[PDB]
A = this chain, B = another copy of it.
Amino acid sequence: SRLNRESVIDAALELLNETGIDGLTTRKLAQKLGIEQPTLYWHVKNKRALLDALAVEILARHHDYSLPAAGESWQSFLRNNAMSFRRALLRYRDGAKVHLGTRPDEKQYDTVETQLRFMTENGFSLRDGLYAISAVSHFTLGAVLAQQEHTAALNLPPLLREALQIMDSDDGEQAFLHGLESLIRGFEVQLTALLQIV
């Protein structure tokens, strides 16, 4: 079938949904594409290359809140951004595993530079803004991975029994959203402290 970049990526994401990340292979992608392996190789050199591009394309396609709205507070941007990042990661099977270990791609440079600049224009040092952004990313990544990998892997004392009912009660959104608010407020307390002991 068609082997332009967009079509290869479409097929790969469809396969990711079928197999998950551990089970995704270039051999299986070739089969899905109706092509022989040396044909695939011309287009896609190895699994790493493919995973690198899926991480980028999952966000380009589905991570819609990458930029602050005009006038938006930094707290609100981080909140919407995290929510959007989470949704994009959850969209495909093992999506968070796909993102892990990537670094920003050149096609994301201007976006991510805008995010870092925006934090600094709101009073953060570059370093502190980066810490806040990285904490949001790590927290969101952790939460999504816990959920998705929990699913992959698939006598109690009373408080643990209950905690597990609680967790078995929703998809992880409630705990994520509550933690996110805590994270943001801690950042704010830090920012507003300046050089005061806090």
Contacts and interface: CB of A to CB of B under 8 A. Distances in A.
Interface of A: 22, 48, 52, 100-104, 106, 109-110, 112-113, 116-117, 120, 126-128, 130-132, 134-135, 137-143, 145-146, 149-153, 155-160, 162-164, 166-167, 174-176, 178-179, 181-187, 189-190
16 contacts: A102-B153, A109-B157, A116-B163, A126-B159, A126-B163, A128-B178, A130-B166, A134-B179, A137-B146, A138-B179, A141-B142, A141-B145, A145-B145, A181-B190, A183-B183, A186-B186
Contacts of A185: 185-186, 189-190
Contact of A139 (B130, B139, B149, B166): B139
A109 B159 CA distance: 10
The 7 closest A-B pairs by CB, nearest first: A182-B186, A142-B142, A138-B142, A135-B179, A101-B149, A186-B186, A101-B153
A182 to B, nearest CB: 3
Contacts of A176: 138
B153 A48 contact: yes
Report the copy number of this chain in the oligomer: 2
A148 B68 CA distance: 30
A174 B128 CA distance: 11
Contacts of A126: 159, 162-163, 166
Contact of A113 (B157, B182, B187, B190): B157
B48 A131 contact: no
Contact of A187 (B101, B139, B155, B182): B182
A112 B164 CA distance: 12
Contacts of A127: 166
